[PDB]
Design an enzyme around this catalytic site. Structure first.
Site, PDB file in Angstrom:
ATOM      1  N   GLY A   1       1.727  -2.174   2.809  1.00  0.00           N
ATOM      2  CA  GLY A   1       3.261  -1.975   2.543  1.00  0.00           C
ATOM      3  C   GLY A   1       3.692  -2.239   1.202  1.00  0.00           C
ATOM      4  O   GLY A   1       4.943  -1.765   0.633  1.00  0.00           O
ATOM      5  N   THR A   2       2.972  -2.917   0.416  1.00  0.00           N
ATOM      6  CA  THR A   2       2.744  -3.220  -0.751  1.00  0.00           C
ATOM      7  C   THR A   2       3.876  -3.916  -1.629  1.00  0.00           C
ATOM      8  O   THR A   2       4.175  -3.601  -2.893  1.00  0.00           O
ATOM      9  CB  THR A   2       2.625  -1.780  -1.492  1.00  0.00           C
ATOM     10  OG1 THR A   2       1.543  -0.918  -0.822  1.00  0.00           O
ATOM     11  CG2 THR A   2       2.113  -1.899  -3.049  1.00  0.00           C
ATOM     12  N   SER A   3       4.660  -4.686  -0.962  1.00  0.00           N
ATOM     13  CA  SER A   3       5.755  -5.459  -1.335  1.00  0.00           C
ATOM     14  C   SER A   3       5.642  -6.520  -0.479  1.00  0.00           C
ATOM     15  O   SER A   3       6.322  -6.668   0.595  1.00  0.00           O
ATOM     16  CB  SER A   3       7.032  -4.659  -1.252  1.00  0.00           C
ATOM     17  OG  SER A   3       8.112  -5.475  -1.823  1.00  0.00           O
TER      18      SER A   3
END
EC number: 3.4.25.1
Lengths: 205, 250, 245, 122, 243
Positions: free
Chosen positions: A9-11
């Site tokens: 989900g990269t955050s």
């Protein structure tokens, strides 16, 4: 050779507050454009007071993390409780020798009662970096300004709780490989507290 | 370190004897009474499971092990020796017949494997045999119902009915008369109970006796509560309550 | 001659093989070393015996470092001590590379400790026969540990060994008892010198050379150092004061 | 009355706190003797018996001293007679320093018993 | 018998010199331990033998924390106890890595039992003289006490005692468990169970014990923790001020 590939989900973040660290994430696995997972546990305990956020390739992060889990169990029993810096090295070693197959973006954040809360951020290729707070993934550049300006040490739990819910809920909106639940993990000496908020909740709040 | 005991620790003499084995055969006799009856209408095994301290539970002690879903084993001798040999016996049964040949092993061929391990730990220096004798009971369509003994020697033989451990000679004898070719499984459970009653009293109750059968089974635990592909495994081991209930009607 | 004196490929009726028992006996006829735990550090001292004028002062050293902040001295059989340390180094370095931190003293102790135990379960691999007084400071304090032949170790607050053990231990417990644990690191250097000087009274058919070191959190700034210069002259002064001179 | 009551409570609490199962200052045998005669005058004979049994299970100051407090107490009940004789039975069966061995000078044990027997015989 | 000390052969006796002496030498540290299970807790109390003033009184341990749930008391010489402790710690973590599930008591017992049997079979390793009392409040097996003894024999117990004064302790546990008609403690709060334990221990061993004479390890569902000096004192204090 892995056929297809996977993404998260990269955050991801670890934020220091009054009494420790509060760890925050979005979770979502996709395999292409098939939504492999709405919800996920990528909020990973590697020791009882030291958790991490896993980002990058699902297959790879999980495979590494399991190995880190074995070393830090054995590490506890024999050589005494770890530190955030101890966990971080083990993660890095495994990424660096096998950076020929691995893509792992790791924040390891843990609480110690003589260092207070600690954030160690290990990007791709693997290098240990100590920071007082972190944001990672590829959506982090876009919230760099917010985060730096409103980052404050020793902020009230209620205020940090809002700050993480808000920080991600903005990040998730503008970024596209982000999505699913926001889960958060409070680490203080009283133990580990688990928060989950679903899509319909956080967007609104 | 290794390489100090590479002479065998069985050697011959002009009486041909193998030191280690004679000593180990004695150990089997000093075990507890375990028996096997083939009733040629199933197979029934019973043994005593017994405390060794007043605050030792017996419901954490079994002498009956499953080797595979449908081959069971019982023993007399050294407890440790039995568990370690059982792990290795399990190993070959699972990897070499259920993956290679896709099915459960034939008993007699599994009897050959277990023998070969025991004979091997005697032939190789620096180590001793296992000081146990096992009775391996199984069922197959092809062979019927079967029962073998495998010795500490790594010799084998089949036995219509046999007993090992304490009170071996008398237990086998009484049994031989009471053993018919055509024998009803309920009567064959009584005879076993009856024998173990003659070995022990003053601590003989049905909840300290562990009995297992080859024949009747429960499909409902083999994932065939629903529509079956087949009936499946024939071994099913009794609980204590079932044993005690029959002991009243002994 | 029972195979409980020629082999360790069995358990003994005394719960230990005779040769390990014998290692313990050979530490005691040996040379004196002590270790003093204090509220901010540890101090080490060892008696180096002088037998000739052919020896050079402090160009033979018995206290050898592991890492940079753990100091190791040992009493007993010289070859066995080299081998123990060489091992101690390989563990220490592996730890620093792998976890990116200097190694804890209870950790370091478990690693040497398991290796002393290994050489005591084989019928042809020599036991160790040194008692090692070792320790240093890490990120939750100072620690003094003592390792034995048999693989036995515990944490100490005062430790003594050797020929002059009896004497040494007497002075040493008095001073430790008197103090919160040992008072300042600085005070402890002089004290340490008195014990070694006092133990030397048990062997006056030889001379000594006093050798001290220390490892102290704020009084060496986390490092293990040799004790020399002024600090060595002062401890000598104190020692010759009480034991008349 | 009011006197007996203050005096009894004060000497009792302090004796238990000092003596304990391990000394802190302890209390002498004299202190417990004082406490005993105070509590007999204070309250009824059945309450005395009960309170004495409960103390003696701790360890006492020694088993011997407990036998000495029984011996006194018995004499006093026998002075008063009638229903007080009934209570004499009561002390004896409850306290096991005078119905069981706890020590091996138990001459006071046989002696208390003979006093009870004599009455029973009447 | 046989001649087990010179070659690895059997005895006609069935039990060998290595096994027979491992049964004996397990006490020379002057130690006694007991373990009881509560309704929903498990308590271990063990003698703590700090014999000198040259040693810190809390580096002397005999209770090891093998896992996060599982505790192991080793009754044996201290090199043998640590040899067993090291192996047990790896097997506990390795089992979690591969099989995704923390270690229970019975599976650790089994692994070690098999090892001890092999080193008796070998002529190239010695076996150890350790009795390992494994304890927990397992998730599926309930409150648990599983004790291994040297031989490679192990079995599950109601409650157990170890040390030369095993017999004295046993008669007290027996008396309670018959009276109550269950094989666990009716109580369900680990404080009251710890307090009870000490009571029966004072009685058996005939000396009143201090905090520095005891060392307490407590098991509860999903956690294992050791009780400190102050913590032990709080329990002791009540036993000294009641009859």
């Amino acid at each position: 050779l892995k056929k297809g590939e996977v993404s998260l989900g990269t955050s991801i973040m670890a934020v220091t507050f009054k009494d420790g660290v509060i760890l925050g994430a979005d979770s979502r696995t996709t395999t292409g454009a098939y939504i492999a997972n709405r919800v996920t546990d990528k909020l990973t305990r590697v020791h009882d007071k030291i958790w991490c956020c896993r980002s990058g390739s699902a297959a790879d992060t999980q495979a590494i993390a399991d190995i880190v889990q074995y070393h830090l169990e054995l590490y506890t029993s024999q050589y005494g409780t770890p530190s955030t810096e101890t966990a971080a090295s083990v993660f890095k070693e495994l990424c660096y020798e096998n950076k020929d197959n691995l893509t792992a973006g790791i924040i390891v954040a843990g609480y110690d009662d003589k260092n207070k809360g600690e954030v160690y951020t290990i990007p791709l290729g693997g290098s240990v970096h100590k920071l007082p707070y972190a944001i990672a993934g590829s959506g982090s550049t876009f919230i760099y300004g917010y985060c730096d300006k409103n980052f404050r040490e020793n902020m009230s739990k209620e205020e940090t709780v809002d700050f993480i819910k808000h920080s991600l809920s903005q990040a998730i909106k503008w970024d596209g490989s982000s999505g699913g639940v926001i889960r958060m993990v409070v680490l203080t000496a009283a133990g580990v507290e688990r928060l989950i908020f679903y899509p319909d909740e956080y967007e609104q709040l | 370190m290794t390489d100090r005991y590479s002479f065998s620790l069985t050697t011959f003499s002009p009486s041909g004897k193998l030191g280690q084995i004679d000593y180990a055969l004695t150990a089997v006799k000093q075990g507890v009474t375990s028996l096997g009856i083939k009733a040629t209408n199933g197979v029934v095994i019973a043994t005593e499971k017994k405390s060794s301290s007043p605050l030792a539970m017996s419901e954490t002690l079994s002498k009956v092990s499953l080797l595979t879903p449908d081959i069971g084993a019982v023993y007399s001798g050294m407890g440790p020796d039995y568990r370690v040999l059982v792990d290795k016996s399990r190993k070959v049964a699972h990897t070499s017949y259920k993956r290679i040949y896709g099915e459960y092993p034939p008993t007699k061929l599994l009897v050959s494997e277990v023998a070969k391990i025991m004979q091997e730990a005697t032939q190789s220096g620096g180590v001793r045999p296992f000081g146990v004798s096992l009775l391996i009971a199984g069922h197959d369509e092809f062979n019927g119902f079967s029962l073998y003994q495998v010795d500490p020697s790594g010799s084998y033989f089949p036995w219509k009915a046999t007993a090992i451990g304490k009170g071996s000679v008398a237990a086998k004898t009484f049994l031989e008369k009471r053993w018919n070719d055509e024998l009803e499984l309920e009567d064959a459970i009584h005879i076993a109970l009856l024998t173990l009653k003659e070995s022990v009293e003053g601590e003989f109750n049905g909840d300290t006796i562990e009995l297992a059968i080859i024949g009747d089974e429960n499909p409902d635990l083999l994932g065939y509560t629903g529509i079956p592909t087949d009936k499946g495994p024939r071994f099913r081991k009794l609980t204590s309550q079932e044993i005690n209930d029959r002991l009243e009607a002994l | 001659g029972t195979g409980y004196d020629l082999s360790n490929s069995v358990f003994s009726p005394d719960g230990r093989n005779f040769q390990v028992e014998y290692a313990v006996k050979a530490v005691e006829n040996g040379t004196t070393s002590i270790g003093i735990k204090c509220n901010d550090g540890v101090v080490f001292a060892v008696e180096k015996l002088i037998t000739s004028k052919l020896l050079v002062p402090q160009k033979n050293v018995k206290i050898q470092v592991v890492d940079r902040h753990i100091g190791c001295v040992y009493s007993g059989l010289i070859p066995d001590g080299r081998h123990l340390v060489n091992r101690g180094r390989e563990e220490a370095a592996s730890f620093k590379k792998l976890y990116k931190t200097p190694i804890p003293i209870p950790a370091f102790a478990d690693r040497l400790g398991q290796y002393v135990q290994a050489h005591t379960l084989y019928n042809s691999v020599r036991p160790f026969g040194v008692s090692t007084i070792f320790g240093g400071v890490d990120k939750n304090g100072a620690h003094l540990y003592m390792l034995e032949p048999s693989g036995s170790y515990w944490g100490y607050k005062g430790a003594a060994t050797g020929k002059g053990r009896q004497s040494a231990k007497a002075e040493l417990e008095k001073l430790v008892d008197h103090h919160p644990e040992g008072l300042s690191a600085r005070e402890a250097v002089k004290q340490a010198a008195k014990i070694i000087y006092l133990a030397h009274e048990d062997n006056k058919e030889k001379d000594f050379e006093l050798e001290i070191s220390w490892c102290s959190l704020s009084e060496t700034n986390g490092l293990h150092k040799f004790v020399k210069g002024d600090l060595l002259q002062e401890a000598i002064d104190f020692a010759q004061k009480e034991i008349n001179g | 009355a009011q006197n007996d009551c203050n005096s009894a409570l004060d000497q009792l609490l302090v004796l238990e706190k000092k003596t304990r199962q391990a000394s802190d200052l302890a209390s002498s045998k004299e202190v417990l003797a004082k406490i005993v005669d105070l509590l007999a005058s204070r309250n009824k004979w059945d309450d005395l018996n009960e309170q004495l049994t409960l103390l003696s299970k701790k360890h006492g100051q020694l088993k011997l001293s407990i036998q000495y407090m029984i011996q006194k107490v018995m004499e006093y009940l026998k002075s008063s007679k009638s229903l007080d004789l009934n209570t004499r039975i009561s002390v004896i069966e409850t306290i096991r320093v005078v119905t069981e061995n706890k020590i091996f000078v138990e001459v006071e044990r046989a002696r208390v018993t003979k006093d009870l027997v004599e009455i029973k015989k009447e | 018998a046989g001649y087990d000390r010179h070659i690895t052969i059997f005895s006609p006796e069935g039990r060998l010199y290595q096994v027979e002496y491992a049964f004996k030498a397990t006490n020379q540290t002057n130690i006694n331990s007991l373990a009881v299970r509560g309704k929903d807790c498990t308590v271990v109390i063990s003698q703590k033998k700090v014999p000198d003033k040259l040693l810190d009184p809390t580096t002397v341990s005999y209770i090891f924390c093998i896992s996060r749930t599982i505790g192991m008391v080793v009754n044996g010489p201290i090199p043998d106890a640590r040899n067993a402790a090291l192996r047990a710690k790896a097997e506990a973590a390795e089992f979690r890595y591969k099989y995704g599930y923390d270690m229970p008591c019975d599976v650790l017992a089994k692994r070690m039992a098999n090892l001890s049997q092999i080193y008796t079979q070998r002529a190239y390793m010695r076996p150890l003289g350790v009795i390992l009392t494994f304890v927990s409040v397992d998730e599926e097996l309930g409150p648990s006490i599983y004790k291994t003894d040297p031989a490679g024999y192990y079995v599950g117990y109601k409650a157990t005692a170890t040390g030369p004064k095993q017999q004295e302790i046993t008669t007290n546990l027996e008396n309670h468990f018959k009276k109550s008609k269950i094989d666990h403690i009716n109580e369900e709060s680990w404080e009251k169970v710890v307090e009870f334990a000490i009571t029966h221990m004072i009685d058996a061993l005939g000396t009143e014990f201090s905090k520095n004479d005891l060392e307490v390890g407590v098991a509860t569902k999903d956690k294992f923790f050791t009780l400190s000096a102050e913590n032990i004192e709080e329990r002791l204090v009540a036993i000294a001020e009641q009859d």
